[PDB]
Design a protein around this ligand. Sequence first.
Ligand SMILES: [Mg+2]
Ligand SMILES: [Mg+2]
Ligand SMILES: [Mg+2]
Ligand SMILES: [Mg+2]
Ligand SMILES: [Mg+2]
Ligand SMILES: [Mg+2]
Ligand SMILES: [Mg+2]
Ligand SMILES: [Mg+2]
Ligand SMILES: [Mg+2]
Ligand SMILES: [Mg+2]
Lengths: 322, 220, 176, 43, 117, 387, 101
Amino acid sequence: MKYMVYPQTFALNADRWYQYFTKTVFLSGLPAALRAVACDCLLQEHFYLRRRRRVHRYEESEVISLPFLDQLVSTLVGLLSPHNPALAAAALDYRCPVHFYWVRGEEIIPRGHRRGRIDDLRYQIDDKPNNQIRISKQLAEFVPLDYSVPIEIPTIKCKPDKLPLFKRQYENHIFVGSKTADPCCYGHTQFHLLPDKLRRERLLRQNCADQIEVVFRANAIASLFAWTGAQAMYQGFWSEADVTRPFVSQAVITDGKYFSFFCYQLNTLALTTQADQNNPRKNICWGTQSKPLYETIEDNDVKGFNDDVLLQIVHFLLNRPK
Amino acid sequence: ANFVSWKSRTKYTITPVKMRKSGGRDHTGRIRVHGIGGGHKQRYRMIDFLRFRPEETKSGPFEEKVIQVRYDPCRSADIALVAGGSRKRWIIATENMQAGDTILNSNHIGRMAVAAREGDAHPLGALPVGTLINNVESEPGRGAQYIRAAGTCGVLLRKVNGTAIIQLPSKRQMQVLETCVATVGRVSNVDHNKRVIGKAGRNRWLGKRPNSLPPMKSYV
Amino acid sequence: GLEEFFDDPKNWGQEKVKSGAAWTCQQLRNKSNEDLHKLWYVLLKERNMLLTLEQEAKRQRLPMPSPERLDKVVDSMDALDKVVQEREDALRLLQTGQERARPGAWRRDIFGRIIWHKFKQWVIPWHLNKRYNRKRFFALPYVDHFLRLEREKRARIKARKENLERKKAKILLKKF
Amino acid sequence: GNEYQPSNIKRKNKHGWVRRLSTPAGVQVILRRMLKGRKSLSH
Amino acid sequence: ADRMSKWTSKRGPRSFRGRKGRGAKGIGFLTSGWRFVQIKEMVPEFVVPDLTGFKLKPYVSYLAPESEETPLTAAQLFSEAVAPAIEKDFKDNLEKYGFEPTQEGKLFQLYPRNFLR
Amino acid sequence: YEWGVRSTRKSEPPPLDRVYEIPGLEPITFAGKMHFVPWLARPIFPPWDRGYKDPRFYRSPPLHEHPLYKDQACYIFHHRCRLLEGVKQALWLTKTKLIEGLPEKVLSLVDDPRNHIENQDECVLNVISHARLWQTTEEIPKRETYCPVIVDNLIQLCKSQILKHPSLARRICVQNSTFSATWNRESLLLQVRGSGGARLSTKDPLPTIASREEIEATKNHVLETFYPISPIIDLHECNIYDVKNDTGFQEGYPYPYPHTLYLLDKANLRPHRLQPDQLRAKMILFAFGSALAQARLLYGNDAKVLEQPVVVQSVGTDGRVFHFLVFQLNTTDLDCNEGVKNLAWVDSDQLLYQHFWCLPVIVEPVGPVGFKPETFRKFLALYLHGA
Amino acid sequence: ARNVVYPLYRLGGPQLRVFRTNFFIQLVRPGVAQPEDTVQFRIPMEMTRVDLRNYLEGIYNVPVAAVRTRVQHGSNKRRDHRNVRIKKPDYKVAYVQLAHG
RNA sequence: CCUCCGCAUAAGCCUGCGUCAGAUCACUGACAAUUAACAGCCCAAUAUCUACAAUCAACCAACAAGUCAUUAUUACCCUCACUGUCAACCCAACAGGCAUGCUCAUAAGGAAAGGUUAAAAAAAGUAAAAGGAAACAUCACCUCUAGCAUCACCAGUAUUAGAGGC
RNA sequence: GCUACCUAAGAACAGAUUUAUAGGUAGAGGCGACAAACCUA
RNA sequence: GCUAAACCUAGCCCCAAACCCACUCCACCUUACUACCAAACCUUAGCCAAACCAUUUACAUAAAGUAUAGGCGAUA
Ligand SMILES: [Mg+2]
Ligand SMILES: [Mg+2]
Ligand SMILES: [Mg+2]
Ligand SMILES: [Mg+2]
Ligand SMILES: [Mg+2]
Ligand SMILES: [Mg+2]
Ligand SMILES: [Mg+2]
Ligand SMILES: [Mg+2]
Ligand SMILES: [Mg+2]
Ligand SMILES: [Mg+2]
């Protein structure tokens, strides 16, 4: 059996419980013609294109915003091609998922013919950001390998059912977005577009005031541990043999009305109970507050270009291995 | 006991459709025919009975170009799906009717006989008496019912004033009017009788479970 | 404020909740409609308190502190509902006067018996209602023997009860 | 032998109420059970 | 081969479970992508007033006296409501008295009823 | 014999009784009660209407009362439009000349080895492994998702090769592209409404390919029509039409001049896909459609010789097999069947590989099979063609 | 809103309000260990999840965020002196996860 | 020491070795459970396209002749409802079966010896000198009937359809 | 609803194969590689 | 001695008279116990009894079990 952790999660206060399922460190912060091009893409999918089907909010981001972020990422790669040479050797997969297995949890199943015995409480996370840039050289570490920190991660309070989840059977796919045979082992960055059903407008219809931040942080942490375990598997490591060089990841998550960034220095490619005793190491997932880039909708062009957004896009898009 | 009939479409189209078999079972649900039905799966395409069917905003003869005789399970001879103007129609291929040839359907009955092609179809007044014929109709515009099996042929035994008389594939005389159109020559898939299955696999695959002269006919 | 979902914490453990009797119907009938809404909401709160307390008492497997209180609040709420129904009935009687509040009829069903069917609020009309036309509400002559048999069973129970009562009366008079 | 391999869809088909009420002899069957006064008036 | 139970949720296969439900009232509609859209229009709407300052407590004190069960008789209530208006008007066409020809324009009609409980 | 039996057709109406035929008296029908039943006379209701206006059942108004239904029906070319006679039919409808072999005006950029990617065949094999091997979670994906992803991969490779020169950096590629246009040819009116892949546009148009001497020589070029099959077949009979020209982009759009288009059939079945000559003709027709759309966007419906010939390229991809072409039109008097006409230079069967082998034998190598990167050199040259 | 036919609604009807909703409620202690931010209840057989949110907002004005529904079939292995299958009171339970911590 | 099973969904049953107490190789009453993204539950009219199999699909190689595609025009704005989720489970004798996805003995799971003694007759296995048995269907073929259409034959036309023989 | 035969529409590996599901043929019957076999001890 | 026995009285029995049954709110002909879109009448048959079998044969009191009819054989 395996528990299921959907990327665009629904639950309230879900960052903490997903974090206990992730055992990462949760910290705040960070580890030209582009504004015109971005406004051009926004106007293209917003106003410069004539929509044959009437624009239904039944596909609100599904008709506009996904192509918007796609245009932004593709043109951003094209523009910053002069800046970061590794981007030439980089693949830009679009709307493709990757899969990995988390292994943590131990408790006797409560009532039935399998009573009392220890059962390997596995879980399978398979998910897609909107567009992923994949690098052929593994990125350097943000903090040091096993760089300690003062605070401790929140711990589970009860069983894995009292929070919103379910446990099914599905095939244990552990995939980087591709098989092992592809050349591009690590990744460059990632671009995630939120699902519609947890919209910030819908969150405003809901009573959940700040937890959009929890939502963004959680889906980012999921993607981060995902790409990192993909790194660990493609690096030949195992729970049978712990990985040493730091798992480095970077990603962007967007919901159209805002943008956010995240980064990952993952450490525990083995997080299972049989090794959790001899486990002084700890992973970290860094991310700061989400912020709005595109502000309003005029008739022709947009205004109020939040230049921190494209600057951080370049900043996460520029780093390279030494 | 509410099985709807398989031929549910009424409009002609170029493609076949999924039809529901009977297997010898009647609409009272019991097998009325022994050893019938249940072959490999095949779809039903509209087979045009009228060789010269006038199209929209048109009249008189018309030519067309064929695509390919493929082995259609709906017929025993080869197939000629042919496009002409803006209309496509699948007919039965003749003895000498190949892809790339142009087929012209004419209805005009000339004063004398008309030296038509091998797979050409014309009215009974536009053909010589004693010519090999296939796809014989029974009335003008009713559709080519008679002489349509693979390799069959019929000879127009006599021609009278506004009438033709042809020996059917059972050597039976059929006398129809001159207003009926028929195709010249013999049908395709010749020597289909001269064939050996070898085993019962093909006969069972033919939709079959195990088992449990005449006077001159007239139509004018 | 979830604090009302349990009862008053002060009265806990006192073995009895000193509550008055239910509101008299005619006495409650003198209150305003807005006051009626207020009373119904207060009744809802107290009844919820009662249900939670009783279920918790089952969870603690102990006796109830005020067992009559729950049913009393239920009875008072029912009386308030009776007053509301009386006022709505007075409105229906005055304004149009139709007898059963829902519009409906007496008819016969496919089981052959006489009943009162209820019409249902539905959009499409009775000349096109794809479901209502499927309702076979017709009975041909094939319901005769069963209908008279139903009459026979009814009569059998009738004579049975009458014989039982009068014979019991005869034994009763024999006892005097 | 395991002959009784019942299935709920086919159960409510071959023993349901709509089919048992589709032809008037079944209506008579319903009435016969009714004057018999059972509980499971259909299946 | 069991029949005496009720027909609640758990009976048979997937869709056979799918159609029926327990005693709810439907709220939405089913449209494309097997996606349900539930309008705020057809939803339940329970707007209770403010309870502050109403002096009528949930229970009534036993010190009060008893009365007679005066059922709301339709003629009695009608007389009590229409007595002054008719008394003035006859001292002075029932539209002045408020007689309703049809309730087709009212929010809370009676025949049929559109109010709730 | 008329097609279709009457058994699964509508039920025949039973005879209305003579009670309804009574000249004086209206019969006591089933109106007062609610029972479509045998014990009375049948209610006869008039034609009622649903007064309410709601999305759920609002039926369309009749298509003779429609606000736009012209007597001259449009022969339409859509994304499913499989032409009849192949590229002969396309040349007949669009009135275009075909020249075997690619046009040398852009092909001269592919002569020098300086315009080449480093380890170009290796990166091509990398795209091949990404597409045919490493696309999805499945062991071996079908070409239905792979080939459009392969087009995306080649487009990304072209976008990434922009470090050498910023010229194509002044170009963008947009999706969800649906243009539409009208053309009056010989006697008929045609409308092409196409939604395709890889709307590749830029700010200024590329220059003309051939000289105006070839344009004058196009008067001698004659459209080989088909007989008796007229070249108006295999369209969509839009009996209700609306006269317009659709550039596919609204106003305020920077860089709106089209350059090239990419097409493929993502079908699970070869029967569900366009045939190879048919797909080539489909690309040619969509090319002519986007060309006429740009012509209407620039100077409108002036049926004459345009001052600057509008030219664009396109390519179809079969998963490994590709067929590219470039077309240059200069005249718009499509009703006239003579004079200057469009010209086309094509290179078909420019495959990426012969096939793909996903598993070994026992032996043969694993991966792409029959790979030829010279066609990939041609495609990458077309990616920078006219810039 | 139990034990009554609600009014028929069309595309654009009025907001069907309530007057004195009869659908009482009962929220009990959790039985197994549960997270802190949710309180569950044994709601009656009728009302919707959004209805539970609305009833809570009316009664106490709670910050309802998430709503949950599970249909606990009553058991049917317990017999009376006539030895018949007598199913228990079946119950559908609900849970409202409250917001703002 | 066993495990050709086991784990899941499917169907199908209906809370059925969960908890606190009774005493019935040593079941009864009360209390608590299963909080969905998976699966159902659907899809605003009228017309109009829909020959180019699949087998790694590029060849060869065919027959049993192919298991899946919209488009045109009009009308249309509001969002997360309801219901399945457990378990040692189902049909039968008082021997057996169960569709489908993964692990081919394994991470999961399971206990054939109640205790003794060491009889024959039986059952199962091991070992033994020396010898080594002291009719129906059917392809192929033949015959016969039937010159033709809207519910089977058949959406067929005597190289066809049906019936007999070997 | 087992089984016999058929239809619809799926599945496994090499056919006169088996099978998950719905549906159809009612005894004066159907079905039947005809066993004078079956169709609920 | 135990198992056991035994106990009246539940209510049934026939009649007399008399004409009865069908709306707490709700839902209830689709898979009955779920709030919602475009069709009916067509003669009962048969044994039994004829010592087997066939035409024939049933499904207030009084005339009178006489007049009518029977493989003129059984009876009605
Ligand atoms: Mg639920
Ligand atoms: Mg879902
Ligand atoms: Mg389970
Ligand atoms: Mg073990
Ligand atoms: Mg044992
Ligand atoms: Mg022993
Ligand atoms: Mg021996
Ligand atoms: Mg020996
Ligand atoms: Mg069956
Ligand atoms: Mg006798």
